[PDB]
Amino acid sequence: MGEVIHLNVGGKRFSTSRQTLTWIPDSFFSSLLSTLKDETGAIFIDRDPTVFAPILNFLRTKELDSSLLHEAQFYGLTPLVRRLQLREELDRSS
């Protein structure tokens, strides 16, 4: 049961599950999977992959581990955006 989704994000390859990409509703991925594919049949995402790895690992693990915030906003990853903004609030000295 389930579906394996292969992604090509600006030339860097990732493989994940449909579940991982769709637990956040109304996101970029929600729409994407409701498209452009490369030679290999992977879904192509025309974005810099530099911070995609930490985005993907958040979607997998539901825990964290700025450009990350900006990409999370682009992809419409609501809880990640929130937790990143609150991380900033936590650090405030004024």
Q: Where are the domains of the chain?
A: 1-94
CATH number at 1-94: 3.30.710.10
53: which strand partners?
none
The continuous run of DSSP H or E covering 7 comes out as strand 4-9
According to DSSP, the residues that pair with 76 across neighbouring strands are none
The contacts of residue 24 (CB under 8 Å, 6+ apart) are: 30, 59, 76, 77, 78, 79, 80
Which method, experimentally, gave rise to this model?
X-ray
Pure H helices in 1-94: 18-22, 28-32, 52-61, 67-74, 78-91
Strand order in the sheet with 43-45: 12-17, 4-9, 43-45
User: Resolution, in Å, please?
Assistant: 1.7
Tell me the CA end-to-end span of the chain in Å, nearest whole number: 50
